[PDB]
Each structure stands twice: as C-alpha cells, then as structure tokens.
C-alpha cells in the first residue's frame, strides 16, 4: 500500500503516480499508448528537410533583418506574432512550420526530452520552457 500511501502534503505528482499504480486499467492504456509512441513514424533529422534545412542559427532572424522587406515594394522600414499578425515573415514562418512538425512528431512518438533538447538547440526558449511544464 505504499503505492497509494500518502498524506494531504503529497503532491499532485505522487497523486498521478498512485493513480497509475492502483488503477490497473489506466496503466494498461498507458502501456498501450507507450507502445504506440515507440512504434511510430519519425522524420529524419539531418537527412531531410526537417532539420537539415532547418538548422537556423537564430530564431526570427529573417524578421529581425528584414521588416516585411520581402512584402514591400521598396527597401522600406510567441507573444509578438500573436498580438500582431503583421510581424511574422515567410522564411521564419516556413522554418517554424518545419521545426513544429519535427517537435510534434517527437512528442507523439514520446521523445519529449529530445524535443526539449531540440527546442534548446534551435533557440526556442519559449517552446522549451513550455515542454518543461
């Protein structure tokens, strides 16, 4: 009974652990989901357009260098692109789409630690902190 043995001071973490320990059916569904995550389709890292072409040195580098310069007829002039649609550029949009497909495939396959390390490598502190939660 140490599996569910706790006090009110025991955290929600230990709560989830005790629930998966005692609830055999939830744990069986979890093992089936773990098998599904293990046997999944994962994109190639350095041998496809996933990361081999998305090896960006800096995040929103295009948005920093240009200012809709691509969407301008001259030389011209995750909270910011949410508050103002006009910010994001096409290059960063496509690269983020690729990195997002990569991270989502990793999460669905269960490699969440590798997805966090990839968010750290790409400079995506936002997605990294989010995955940390």
């Amino acid at each position: 009974n140490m599996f569910e043995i706790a006090a009110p001071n025991a955290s929600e973490k230990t709560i989830v652990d005790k629930l998966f320990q005692r609830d055999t059916l939830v744990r069986q569904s979890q093992l089936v989901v773990d098998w599904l995550e293990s046997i999944a389709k994962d994109e190639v890292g350095d041998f496809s357009d996933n990361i081999e072409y998305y090896a960006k040195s800096v995040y929103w580098e295009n948005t920093l260098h240009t200012l809709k310069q691509r969407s301008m007829l001259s030389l011209g002039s995750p909270d910011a692109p949410i508050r103002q649609k006009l910010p994001l550029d096409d290059l960063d949009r496509e690269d983020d789409i690729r990195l997002l497909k990569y991270l989502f495939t990793l999460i669905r396959a269960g490699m969440t630690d590798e997805a966090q390390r990839l968010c750290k490598r790409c400079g995506q502190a936002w997605r990294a902190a989010t995955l940390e939660g």
């Binding site: 001071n9 929600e12 909270d79 910011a80 103002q84 502190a125 936002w126 940390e132 939660g133």
Partner: protein
C-alpha cells in the same frame, strides 16, 4: 511572544497572518474604489494583500482554476513560479512583451522576482 526550522516557519506564518490582517481593511477599501477591476492595479493590490482564494474568483473573467489545483496540493510552487520567471525574462531579452499593457508587464516582473527593471527603452 514565544525543531528550529519548524519554529522559524511557524513564526513566519504568524507574521504573515499579522501582515495580512493589518492590511486587510485597507485592501478591501481600495478594491471597492477600483470599480471595474483592472489586472494592472486590482491584481497588484490583491497579490500584496493576499486573499488568493478570492483573487482567483476575481480572475474568472479570463478563467483560472490551476489555483484550485494548488489549494488541493500546496506543493512545488517555488519551481512553478521560477519557470514562469524564466519564460518572462526570455520574453524580455527577446525584445517582445513590449506592446502589451504597461503595468501588466509591471505585475509580471513581480512574479518573476525583479523589484526594479531597467528595460530597453531605459524605463
């Protein structure tokens, strides 16, 4: 008034109760004056005067019950708030989180742990 750690913690709890109680009346008066509540000031006043159980009811305009989940298991709050702070400082260093409400950012800095913030605009 009169385990060392436990004793210190109990004293801390009593002092916190005193602080909350001595400011309670003032905080209640202030809130009545606010009228339509504003997360810039209302939330600041609630946070410094405690009463987080009622603060959550006040934050239902956006919807917030992770706090009920906190009252259930008072645990790991330190690390939760620290991760919030990390996210906030990342936003600050990324030149974003600027076109948002002025003192909303002020209140975010409070949970972060920085009592005085010199921003890029030298504010």
């Amino acid at each position: 008034g009169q385990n060392e750690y436990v004793r210190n913690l109990e004293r801390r709890k009593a002092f916190s109760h005193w602080l909350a109680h001595t400011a309670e009346e003032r905080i209640e008066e202030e809130v009545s004056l606010y009228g339509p509540e504003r997360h810039v000031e209302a939330v600041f006043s609630f946070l410094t005067g405690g009463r987080i159980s009622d603060a959550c009811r006040l934050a239902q305009k956006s919807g917030d019950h992770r706090l009920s989940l906190l009252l259930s298991q008072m645990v790991g709050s330190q690390e939760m708030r620290e991760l919030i702070s990390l996210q906030l400082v990342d936003w600050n260093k990324l030149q974003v989180d600027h076109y948002i409400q002025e003192e909303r950012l002020r209140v975010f800095c409070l949970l972060s742990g920085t009592p005085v913030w010199r921003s890029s605009d030298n504010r």
